[PDB]
Design a protein around this ligand. Structure first.
Ligand SMILES: *[C@@H]1O[C@H](CO)[C@@H](O[C@@H]2O[C@H](CO)[C@@H](O[C@@H]3O[C@H](CO[C@H]4O[C@H](CO)[C@@H](O)[C@H](O)[C@@H]4O)[C@@H](O)[C@H](O[C@H]4O[C@H](CO)[C@@H](O)[C@H](O)[C@@H]4O[C@H]4O[C@H](CO)[C@@H](O)[C@H](O)[C@@H]4O)[C@@H]3O)[C@H](O)[C@H]2NC(C)=O)[C@H](O)[C@H]1NC(C)=O
Ligand SMILES: *[C@@H]1O[C@H](CO)[C@@H](O[C@@H]2O[C@H](CO)[C@@H](O[C@@H]3O[C@H](CO)[C@@H](O)[C@H](O)[C@@H]3O)[C@H](O)[C@H]2NC(C)=O)[C@H](O)[C@H]1NC(C)=O
Ligand SMILES: *[C@@H]1O[C@H](CO)[C@@H](O)[C@H](O)[C@H]1NC(C)=O
Lengths: 132, 37, 105
């Protein structure tokens, strides 16, 4: 049994430094990798990426402008912050864990392997919309 | 001939997909073929 | 991208582009009003909690397209299926493919 709680003001003004929080359930953040998924209403989901402390802070290559992810070990909380929200940001978000996976197709010393990630579990999520 | 020769659009490392501006088979009307090197 | 199959019959789902290189396909499903889940976590390996009915193609194919075969369609298969390709040619793609919605009469 895994459950989690999110937050959000519901109505967000344009051009505002929106902040989103996601908590954990039992598993500590040090020994786990988290990921965020953004899905437009009725369309295919979009993967923001994965964030982890101590180096593994890779973000979405396409956006790479205003995304900011931070972690709070004391509070066991992970925060997602966006600066300058637009009208196209109205979508459902999901914070969930992920698991690694390895495959080798060449020489062990010539970097013929890529790590592939799959999300065993998915979060409940919270609705975020922008209006006037 | 000097090759209008650029990066690779994936093939990588020493592969440098490249263009020729060849001489064609009808002894005229040069055509801009390409191949790898 | 809507597929109509009568219950109890066989179904085929086509997703992804041509197989230039090797893949490690991951299969996902979306339920209306419920959180997603997982079905297949590798090219052919599957997790616990599901029988061996689900099948998939290996990643050693060149020039083909990833496909999913489903037989004995039940009422619980009414969900949107998504495919996630993992190619060594292109970088990691963060956008999923054209989701196929399975509807049962
Ligand atoms: C010269 O010397 C070099 C080393 O100095 C040596 O390189 C070796 O190359 C071979 C090429 O075959 C590499 O072997 C691959 O290894 C990985 C990992 O294998 C793991 O699992 C096996 C047990 O199953 C263990 O013994 C091993 O230690 C590892 O833990 C695999 O990726 C490869 O096998 C998969 O891919 C094959 C090709 O697609 C498939 O045919 C096969 O079925 C395997 O599974 C694939 O298909 C499955 C279908 O169901 C699917 O489920 C899987 O996900 C996957 O897609 C392959 O065995 C070997 O690792 C290299 N050496 C090192 C140290 O890394 C050269 O071979 C040697 N010779 C020459 C001539 O140069
Ligand atoms: C093979 O050689 C010919 C030599 O003529 C090359 O033709 C050149 O093509 C380029 C575009 O690829 C042209 O550049 C453009 O031309 C006009 C102005 O002349 C204008 O559209 C742009 O400002 C730009 O400069 C160029 O004029 C044209 N001619 C020359 C002499 O360079 C051709 O590209 C070569 N092909 C390959 C595959 O290398
Ligand atoms: C582009 O060409 C440069 C110069 O040869 C090379 O160093 C670089 O790796 C190439 N980049 C790509 C993405 O192919």
């Amino acid at each position: 049994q895994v459950h989690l709680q999110e937050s959000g003001p519901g109505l967000v003004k344009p051009s505002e430094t929106l902040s989103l929080t996601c908590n954990v359930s039992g598993t500590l953040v040090r020994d786990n990798y988290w990921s965020w998924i953004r899905q437009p209403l009725g369309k295919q989901p979009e993967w923001i990426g994965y964030v982890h402390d101590s180096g593994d802070t890779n973000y979405n290559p396409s956006l790479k402008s205003r995304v900011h992810l931070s972690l709070d070990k004391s509070k066991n909380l992970v925060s997602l912050r966006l600066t300058g929200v637009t009208a196209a940001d109205s979508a459902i978000y999901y914070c969930a864990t992920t698991k690694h996976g390895r495959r080798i197709y060449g020489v062990v010393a010539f970097k013929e392997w890529f790590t592939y990630f799959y999300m065993d579990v998915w979060g409940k999520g919270t609705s975020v919309t922008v209006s006037s | 001939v000097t090759l209008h020769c650029t990066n690779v659009t994936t093939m990588r490392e020493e592969m440098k997909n490249c263009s020729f501006n060849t001489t064609t088979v009808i002894r005229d009307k040069i055509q801009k073929e390409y191949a790898l090197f | 991208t809507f597929v109509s199959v009568a219950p109890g019959q066989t179904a085929r789902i086509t997703c992804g582009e041509e197989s230039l290189g090797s893949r490690s396909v991951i299969w996902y499903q979306q339920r209306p009003g419920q959180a997603p889940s997982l079905i297949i976590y590798n090219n052919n390996d599957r997790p616990s909690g599901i029988p061996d009915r689900f099948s998939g193609s290996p990643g050693s194919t060149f020039g083909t397209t990833a496909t999913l075969t489903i037989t004995s369609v039940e009422a619980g298969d009414e969900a949107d299926y998504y495919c996630h390709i993992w190619d060594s040619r292109r970088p990691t793609n963060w956008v999923f493919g054209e989701g196929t919605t399975l509807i049962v009469l």
